[PDB]
Amino acid sequence: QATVSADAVKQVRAGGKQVPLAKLASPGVMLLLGTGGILGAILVV
Amino acid sequence: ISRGHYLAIAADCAACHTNGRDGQFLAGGYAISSPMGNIYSTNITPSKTHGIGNYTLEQFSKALRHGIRADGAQLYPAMPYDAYNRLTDEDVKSLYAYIMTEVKPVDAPSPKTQLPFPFSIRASLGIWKIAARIEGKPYVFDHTHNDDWNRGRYLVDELAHCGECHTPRNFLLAPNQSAYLAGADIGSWRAPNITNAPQSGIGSWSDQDLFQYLKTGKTAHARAAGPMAEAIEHSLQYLPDADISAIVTYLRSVPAKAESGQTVANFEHAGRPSSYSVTTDGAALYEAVCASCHQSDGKGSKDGYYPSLVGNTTTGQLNPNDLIASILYGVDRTTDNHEILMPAFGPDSLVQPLTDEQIATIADYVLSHFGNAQATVSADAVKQVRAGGKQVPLAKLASPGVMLLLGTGGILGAILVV
Amino acid sequence: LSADVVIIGAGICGSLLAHKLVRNGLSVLLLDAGPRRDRSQIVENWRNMPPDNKSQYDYATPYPSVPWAPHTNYFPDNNYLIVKGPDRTAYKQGIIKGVGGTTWHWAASSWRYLPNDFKLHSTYGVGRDYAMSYDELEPYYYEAECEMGVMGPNGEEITPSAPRQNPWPMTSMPYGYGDRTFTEIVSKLGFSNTPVPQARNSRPYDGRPQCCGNNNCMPICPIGAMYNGVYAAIKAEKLGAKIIPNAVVYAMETDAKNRITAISFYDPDKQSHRVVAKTFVIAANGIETPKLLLLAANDRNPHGIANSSDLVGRNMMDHPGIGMSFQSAEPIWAGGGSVQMSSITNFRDGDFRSEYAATQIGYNNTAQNSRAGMKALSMGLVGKKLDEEIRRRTAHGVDIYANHEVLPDPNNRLVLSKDYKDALGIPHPEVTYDVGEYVRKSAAISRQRLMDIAKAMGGTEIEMTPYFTPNNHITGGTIMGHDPRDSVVDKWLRTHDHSNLFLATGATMAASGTVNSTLTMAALSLRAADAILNDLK
Amino acid sequence: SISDFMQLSAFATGHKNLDLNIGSALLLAFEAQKHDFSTQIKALREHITPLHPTLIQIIRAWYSVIEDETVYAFEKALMYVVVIPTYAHNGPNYWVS
Numbered sequence A: 001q002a003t004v005s006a007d008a009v010k011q012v013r014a015g016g017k018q019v020p021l022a023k024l025a026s027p028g029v030m031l032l033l034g035t036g037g038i039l040g041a042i043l044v045v
Numbered sequence B: 001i002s003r004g005h006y007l008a009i010a011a012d013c014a015a016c017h018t019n020g021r022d023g024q025f026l027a028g029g030y031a032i033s034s035p036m037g038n039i040y041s042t043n044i045t046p047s048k049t050h051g052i053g054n055y056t057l058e059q060f061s062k063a064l065r066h067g068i069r070a071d072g073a074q075l076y077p078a079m080p081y082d083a084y085n086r087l088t089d090e091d092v093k094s095l096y097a098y099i100m101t102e103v104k105p106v107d108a109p110s111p112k113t114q115l116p117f118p119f120s121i122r123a124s125l126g127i128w129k130i131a132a133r134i135e136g137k138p139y140v141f142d143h144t145h146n147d148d149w150n151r152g153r154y155l156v157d158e159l160a161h162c163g164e165c166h167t168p169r170n171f172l173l174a175p176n177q178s179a180y181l182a183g184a185d186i187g188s189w190r191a192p193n194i195t196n197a198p199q200s201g202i203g204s205w206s207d208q209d210l211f212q213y214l215k216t217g218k219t220a221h222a223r224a225a226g227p228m229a230e231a232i233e234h235s236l237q238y239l240p241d242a243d244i245s246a247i248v249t250y251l252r253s254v255p256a257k258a259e260s261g262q263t264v265a266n267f268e269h270a271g272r273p274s275s276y277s278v279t280t281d282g283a284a285l286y287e288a289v290c291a292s293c294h295q296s297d298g299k300g301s302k303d304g305y306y307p308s309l310v311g312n313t314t315t316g317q318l319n320p321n322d323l324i325a326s327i328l329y330g331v332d333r334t335t336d337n338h339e340i341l342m343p344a345f346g347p348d349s350l351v352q353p354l355t356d357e358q359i360a361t362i363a364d365y366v367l368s369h370f371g372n373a374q375a376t377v378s379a380d381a382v383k384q385v386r387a388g389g390k391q392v393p394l395a396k397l398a399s400p401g402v403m404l405l406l407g408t409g410g411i412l413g414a415i416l417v418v
Numbered sequence C: 001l002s003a004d005v006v007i008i009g010a011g012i013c014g015s016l017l018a019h020k021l022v023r024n025g026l027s028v029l030l031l032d033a034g035p036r037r038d039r040s041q042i043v044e045n046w047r048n049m050p051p052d053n054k055s056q057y058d059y060a061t062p063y064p065s066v067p068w069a070p071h072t073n074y075f076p077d078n079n080y081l082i083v084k085g086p087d088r089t090a091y092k093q094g095i096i097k098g099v100g101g102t103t104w105h106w107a108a109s110s111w112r113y114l115p116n117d118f119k120l121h122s123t124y125g126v127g128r129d130y131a132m133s134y135d136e137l138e139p140y141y142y143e144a145e146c147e148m149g150v151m152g153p154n155g156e157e158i159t160p161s162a163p164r165q166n167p168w169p170m171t172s173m174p175y176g177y178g179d180r181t182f183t184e185i186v187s188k189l190g191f192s193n194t195p196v197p198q199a200r201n202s203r204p205y206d207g208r209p210q211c212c213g214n215n216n217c218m219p220i221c222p223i224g225a226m227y228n229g230v231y232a233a234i235k236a237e238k239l240g241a242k243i244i245p246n247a248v249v250y251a252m253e254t255d256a257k258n259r260i261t262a263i264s265f266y267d268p269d270k271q272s273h274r275v276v277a278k279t280f281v282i283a284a285n286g287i288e289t290p291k292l293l294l295l296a297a298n299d300r301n302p303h304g305i306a307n308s309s310d311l312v313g314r315n316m317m318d319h320p321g322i323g324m325s326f327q328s329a330e331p332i333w334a335g336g337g338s339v340q341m342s343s344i345t346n347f348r349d350g351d352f353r354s355e356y357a358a359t360q361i362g363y364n365n366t367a368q369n370s371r372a373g374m375k376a377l378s379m380g381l382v383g384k385k386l387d388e389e390i391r392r393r394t395a396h397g398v399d400i401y402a403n404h405e406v407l408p409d410p411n412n413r414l415v416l417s418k419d420y421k422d423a424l425g426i427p428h429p430e431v432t433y434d435v436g437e438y439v440r441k442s443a444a445i446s447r448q449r450l451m452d453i454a455k456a457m458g459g460t461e462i463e464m465t466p467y468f469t470p471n472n473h474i475t476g477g478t479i480m481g482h483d484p485r486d487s488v489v490d491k492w493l494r495t496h497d498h499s500n501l502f503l504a505t506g507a508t509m510a511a512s513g514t515v516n517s518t519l520t521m522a523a524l525s526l527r528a529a530d531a532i533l534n535d536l537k
Numbered sequence D: 001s002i003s004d005f006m007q008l009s010a011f012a013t014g015h016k017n018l019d020l021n022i023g024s025a026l027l028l029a030f031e032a033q034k035h036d037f038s039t040q041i042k043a044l045r046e047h048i049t050p051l052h053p054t055l056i057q058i059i060r061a062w063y064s065v066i067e068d069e070t071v072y073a074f075e076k077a078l079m080y081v082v083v084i085p086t087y088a089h090n091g092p093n094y095w096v097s
């Protein structure tokens, strides 16, 4: 029942599937949280 | 014929309102590609339930020059309403006669614009329009320049909207009036600079060469392809010869706006004399596909049906973005019902489907031996073109991650209030 | 490996069936012996082919022969095809396996048969008439003509010819110089020379360019103006089906009801692969469909698949051809145009068909510079004398054929042979061919007419061939008929005993006719399109 | 030892212009077909200032590939490529080139 896809191996060579927290460490994922974060400041006004 | 007809001819108002040649003209369905998605153009025939048969003069004019549909919503800016805005209020009602009287009503639903992330809400365009300063005091006939020139600014800018494809865009996908008719890539293709710059525009083009390009689309140093093939065979060729002479006049007057690192005007860049040794070879893999119609020296045919690759404005550009579209999609014009065609050489091509790598080599050989040797094609400058060109910096917003992040970051400002 | 319908043979017939089927919904698989061959590679091969193989027409060298399931050759032979009989030379006809089928190389002359030719036995009492009549086939002619983008002499009334209820999609490209001169002099003689319908683009069509007289139209056309099977194969494969190259089919599995339900097919290295589908189609060739049906004799089927009348591999037909070659008096300048423009259609019908065979004189428009240059070289000339000789022999070269209509005589056969094997051990097929006194008398008359044409041009160095030459299109092999016990397939292209086997191939026809005839092959393949759909809907 | 192969015959008796180094690929191949090739080709330059009224041996280096004293001899009426109305009433008749 257990089978390996040709790309279940590329995950392992990379280090396994990325845990859902390391996604935060890429500048796009924070810059977006930046302006969205700032956009709440104007909502105060 | 009819004056109302003439304006739709000049305004090209049917290149967008009939899906393909076989459609019923002015019916809608031509899904023009766009970064935001595939907006579907809408029926314009005076149909009392589907088209604009219900439209009146003030309801028409709001649509044409301000991009507001009848019931209130905002028309997508796939319109050249920012080019149609300055159109005289006389011609706007002249179009109105043609659409209500001349064309024939057709009874059909028109597929609607299925857009992704917030670009799908129309009402925000009024926020966009004010950012783009598109209200512009409709055209008043100037007097310091003779009527030959005045019409030129009136055809290039308002009616034929040469800009809406040529002049580049800003971050907010709006006309970027600093470089006016200077050339931005248009999805797959790239409209070349058409200012008066001598070595970096069309200011070096011979006057009788420039008129001959616009009227037919065929000349020794340049053949019109892509969205000009769709513009020359649809609008320009029908313009009376007096009108093109206006466009020719104005094009000579536009101030030059230069380019990054050019040494000779695109149609003078002569090519090295070489050949191949009688796959994985720019000199062979060209001779085995391209040298039948052109020759092995790229000089083309002996009377002109096959253009000379030497001194060709699609080779001798520093940006090879056109020359990769010409290989990928071929060229297909129809002037006076004489269609000249070139087979597509793309993935789903039918004569010989080249590979994403192989096209570059032939694209890279032609540039090295015929085109701007400084200008080169990487193996993946072609995959961009097959995809539709580099993503403009606004379509990135239409992927759920890019908004969800803006969501929680947006909410996280609410707690900052407390 | 399974799908809703399996078709084997990615040629003109199999590809048209594939495209139609996928257009109507049912999924499809294509299996062809050859590889995916690209037109540019073939052109590069042809350009470097030595000018001896261009001087006398070789149509197989530029298509490199796969070693496992090769295609025929006739410049020094590979002996794939073995031919037996008094006129064995006539059946030395070449095919080109691979996706696109043999249609990769073909002058694209796509003719319509006369309405008599479908009622040949019922009209002249010779041969066997088809199962259906031309009126029952016309719509499929017009669909095939629209799909291949066929030219035509629309604005003209010519000669014995099919009644056209619908104009040809394009109109004939104007004649070169050779064709005008030929038609004028032969009009002077008493024969009518009328244009050949062809599958070229005289205006841009279908998304591929207009013919510009590359004149390489038999071996390979570099730009795609003419038609090849690979276009339909490409359209169908992109539409959603699947295609598998090198998939040589060698055995077919059935039950006692004799419905096909599986096939085992070699890949290049003898590994068996098995396929199951609702309905199976064999479209290999006029030669390779009877060979495959003979090869798959089963436990249920001792001597051949669908062989309930012992006719598969029997009744082999092909147009025997007499050649000619000379030098005209006034220049001909042969070469401008395509390879096959005109034809003398004057004889294609009449009251003689009960006595001998109807011919179709023509000539061949392929350029002479190659052969003429080689002839003037081997005449051992030198200098300006050599150059003048090259120009004269290339501005005067002439080439004429005279095909014939051969009858189906059951003594002809396709015994798959034993003396030769290949890298799969599958038999090399062998053909027994006899022409009959029918075409013997017809060919005497043809020799006279060809000599008369030669004299009319003032021909010098007239060198007729004495032996009948092939014409490369295979007719007969699985004859249609109403009665299941004297004919394999029925009026709907479904093998009688194998109620689930559809044979869309040129072996199905019951008359060789007088004209280059894969259009009927392609317009009977589109007949099996509706037979399959109605039976699987 | 190429300039004694390009220059061998003449301008007129052969291509007036160069082979365009298609003989610089011939010469390599004639090395293998004849070891003594580069030897005799020098000896046939002074003799025009026996040696092929019967010794046809050097015609093979002048026949060849076709090289019918040729991209061909008479290209102004025929193909191998030319424009779509290639037909123009046959052009000329024996006005060589």
Ligand SMILES: Cc1cc2nc3c(=O)[nH]c(=O)nc-3n(C[C@H](O)[C@H](O)[C@H](O)COP(=O)(O)OP(=O)(O)OC[C@H]3O[C@@H](n4cnc5c(N)ncnc54)[C@H](O)[C@@H]3O)c2cc1C
Pocket: C008, C009, C010, C011, C012, C013, C014, C031, C032, C033, C034, C059, C069, C094, C095, C096, C097, C098, C100, C101, C102, C103, C104, C105, C106, C107, C108, C109, C110, C111, C218, C229, C247, C248, C249, C250, C283, C284, C285, C286, C288, C291, C292, C426, C471, C472, C473, C474, C506, C515, C516, C517, C518, C519, C521
């Ligand atoms: C010189 C020339 C002239 C022509 N002139 C004309 C003309 O005038 N008019 C016209 O209409 N047409 C003309 N034709 C075209 C010809 O009529 C068609 O191309 C032909 O009918 C279609 O054959 P095909 O290429 O489709 O065969 P294919 O589709 O290539 O057959 C391949 C099939 O063979 C099978 N196969 C191969 N080897 C084996 C094996 N050992 N055992 C079992 N199965 C095997 C494969 O599995 C596959 O199914 C001409 C062709 C040539 C070359």
Ligand code: HEC
Pocket: B008, B011, B012, B013, B014, B015, B016, B017, B032, B039, B040, B041, B042, B043, B044, B051, B052, B060, B063, B064, B069, B070, B074, B075, B076, B077, B078, B079, B080, B095
């Ligand atoms: C492609 C650049 C177009 C040209 C040229 C013309 N039209 Fe257009 N039109 C186009 C699109 C993509 C849309 C819908 C987009 C949206 O934001 O909804 C429209 C819409 C109209 C309308 C609104 C009424 C309706 O669509 O039902 C009108 C009245 C209209 N278009 C008119 C019009 C005229 C008169 C043109 C010639 C001067 C013309 N358009 C050109 C795309 C394009």
Ligand code: HEC
Pocket: B218, B221, B222, B223, B224, B225, B286, B289, B290, B291, B292, B293, B294, B305, B306, B307, B312, B313, B314, B315, B323, B326, B327, B331, B333, B340, B341, B342, B343, B345, B362, B363, B366, C209, C222, C223
């Ligand atoms: C005949 C079937 C062709 C083959 C094969 C190739 N090209 Fe072509 N090309 C052809 C025509 C008839 C035209 C122009 C049509 C007209 O109306 O003038 C072209 C055009 C080009 C161009 C651009 C010309 C222009 O845009 O002004 C380029 C850059 C070009 N062709 C290159 C090219 C390459 C790289 C080819 C092999 C992959 C090739 N062509 C083949 C005719 C034919």
Ligand code: HEC
Pocket: B155, B156, B160, B161, B162, B163, B164, B165, B166, B186, B189, B190, B191, B192, B193, B194, B201, B202, B213, B214, B222, B224, B225, B226, B227, B228, B231, B236, B247, B266, B313, B314, B321, B322, B323, B325
């Ligand atoms: C988008 C639909 C355009 C419209 C509207 C106009 N032009 Fe254009 N132009 C466009 C393209 C896509 C191309 C060629 C693309 C390629 O890679 O080949 C062009 C080209 C020209 C040229 C030639 C420039 C050159 O090749 O150096 C000229 C002179 C030109 N276009 C003029 C022109 C005019 C006057 C227009 C208003 C009537 C006009 N174009 C509209 C894109 C589009």
Ligand code: F3S
Pocket: C200, C210, C211, C212, C213, C214, C215, C216, C217, C218, C220, C221, C222, C223, C224, C225, C226, C337, C338, C339
């Ligand atoms: S090569 Fe093709 S271009 Fe026409 S003349 Fe021949 S069919």
